[PDB]
Structure formats: C-alpha cells, structure tokens
Design a protein around this ligand. Structure first.
Ligand SMILES: [Cl-]
Ligand SMILES: [Cl-]
Ligand code: NA
Ligand code: NA
Ligand code: NA
Ligand code: NA
Lengths: 187, 184
C-alpha cells in the first residue's frame, strides 16, 4: 500500500538530515523506502533555474507546481504503488508557506492549482522542524522568513492530525527518536 | 486603454506570418505596437523545460502557465497600460487547445490556474488560423484543431475564424477588416 511521509521547515531546520535519518531507520527495519525532495524531484531544471531567476510569485509557484506534478506522477506515486514508504524532503506545504504566506499568494488558488498536480495524494504525516529564522543553520530580510515560519505553524495547527511539529534546536538524535515515536503506530 | 489581440492556430497555420503582418499594418497607422509571443515571452528559459521527454500533461501545462503569468505581468499588462496595441502570437487558448482538447486536461482547471493575477485580462479579438490537421500523431492534431474550433464556437465575438489555406494577403485583409471598428 505504501506510506507517504513529508518533512518541512525553513532551509537549515534540519529537515534534510532528518529525512536521511528516517530513511536509515526504515532501512534498519527492513522496510522498503524511497527518499526524494522538492524542488527538482520531478524536473531537475526547475531547481537549477530558480537558484538565479527572479520571478513573480505566480510564476515561481507555477514552476514549482510543474516540478511537483512530475514528481508526483513519475516518482512518488510509482514508489507508493510498489508499497514503499516514500519520504519527500519538501512537498506542497513548502509552496503554501513560501509562495503563500511568504510571498502573499492566496491559499485557495494555490490549492486548486495543486489539486490536479498532486492527484489527490496527501502525506499521512508531515514532520515540521520549527525554529526561528535566526536559528536556521543554513533585520529587514528576516520579515519574509518569519512569515514563512508562522505560515508553517498556521498550516500545522489547521491539520493537527497530519502535522507533527518538532523543536528543530534539539539534538539531531533526539529529534530522530521523536520522529520514530510518532511514526511507529503507523507501520 | 490599449488593445489586446492574439493569434492562434496549429504550428504551420500562418498564425506567425499574420501576427507580423498585423504589427506592420497597425504601425503604418501610427498606432504604437508591441509584438510578443508564447511560449517564451515571459520566461524564455521555459522553452528548454517544455521539450522534456514524456512530460505529464499537468506538468506541461504548468510550465506554459508560469511563462504565461510572467508574460501577463511583465509584458502584456504594462504594454496595454502605455496604450499600445499588444499582439501575442499565442496565449491561453493555445494551452486550452493543446493541453485541454489535445492532452485531455479539464478546461475549468486550466482556466482557474490562468486567472490569477491577470485582473480579468482577455483578448479583445483572437484571430484563429484554422489549418487542416494533416497540414500540421494525427489523432492529437485533429483534437487540437477541432478544440480550437470549439473554443471559437463558444466565444463567437472574440474569435475570428480564418481559413488558413487562403492566400496570406487575403487572410491579412480579412484581419484588417475585423479590426477597422476598433480603430478610429
Ligand atoms: Cl534543512
Ligand atoms: Cl504559425
Ligand atoms: Na503545486
Ligand atoms: Na508536506
Ligand atoms: Na494545513
Ligand atoms: Na483550428
């Protein structure tokens, strides 16, 4: 049947390390796992273009959406179909937090765009590594990042049965054990 | 106020020739003109991504939509704000015909994606160069060609359906004639 898990948070929140540690945990249990990420899991050139390219919020979101649609169709759904636990480092919630709450696009339109792109797929659990922007390991520019951080927390409190919010400043090993604890009833 | 005109049709329909001829005609009337096109008028780099092998229909559309959003914001709306006649060689109708009728994506979704940030912008007129599909797989091209004609049937004041097999200069004169009333 497979199981779709995601990790979310600011760049430097540790969600990339935790995604790796989660995959390793599953490997040690003998559970087939596929680790992937956005942007670029669908369309690698989208990732490379957006390193440098300045774009409107709409166009940025739509490029990210094209990547996500191809990611869903070619990577995630086929992995789930083989009964893998598929872990994505970032998924739709990243666009909602960054292009929505950060850059100001309205969530209902963002979700309508995503509806066909994601084909009704939803993460069973989403681990949000929360910390303030000043704690991310990787004045005025921080206002955006605080909108993003708050936007994530807004998403989480709207879906408390999907989000698990973790103190990203805790030791790496302890965050990983918290993740495992939340996940264990679902395997 | 400015004036937004588009041209549509299959590749090889003469849509591009007519867009260029129209720009030259409107300029000869002292009317300031901005000639532009999709894909690439918004995000030139989209052209590369669009060639991706076996791209899902959703991803293909969404790429077109990113370029189109940037095109609308940065090129088209500012051109119209300056009172120019803005002519786009392809616009949303291309995606509706190709990704909707051709690849089977639902038109309401395509339109809801497109609607954002456009301030209700629609072409005032859309000149459809109707080309038989074999002159462009063939099944796909038939759906796209007939898709365009369905769009035109649905909005009969906006679309001007032209037989693309006619001599280029006759097509140009028909386009000019439709435009007469929208000029002084
Ligand atoms: Cl990270
Ligand atoms: Cl053409
Ligand atoms: Na999306
Ligand atoms: Na997510
Ligand atoms: Na939510
Ligand atoms: Na046609």
């Amino acid at each position: 049947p497979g199981l779709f898990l995601t990790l979310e948070g600011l760049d430097g929140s540790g969600k990339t390390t935790q995604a790796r540690r989660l995959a390793a945990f599953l490997e040690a249990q003998g559970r087939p796992v596929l680790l992937t990420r956005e942007p670029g899991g669908g369309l690698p050139e989208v990732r490379s273009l957006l390193l440098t390219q300045e774009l409107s919020p709409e166009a940025e979101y739509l490029l990210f959406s094209a990547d996500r649609a191809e990611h869903v169709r070619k990577v995630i759904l086929p992995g789930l179909a083989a009964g893998k636990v598929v872990i994505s480092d970032r998924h739709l919630d990243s666009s909602l937090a960054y292009q929505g709450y950060g850059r100001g696009l309205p969530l209902p339109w963002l979700r309508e765009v995503a509806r066909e792109a994601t084909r009704g797929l939803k993460p069973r659990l989403t681990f949000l590594l929360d910390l303030p922007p000043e704690a991310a390991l990787r004045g005025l520019g921080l206002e955006f990042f605080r909108r993003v951080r708050e936007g994530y927390l807004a998403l989480a409190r709207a879906e408390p049965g999907r989000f698990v919010v973790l103190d990203a400043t805790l030791p790496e090993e302890e965050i990983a054990r918290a993740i495992q604890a939340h996940l264990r009833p679902l395997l």
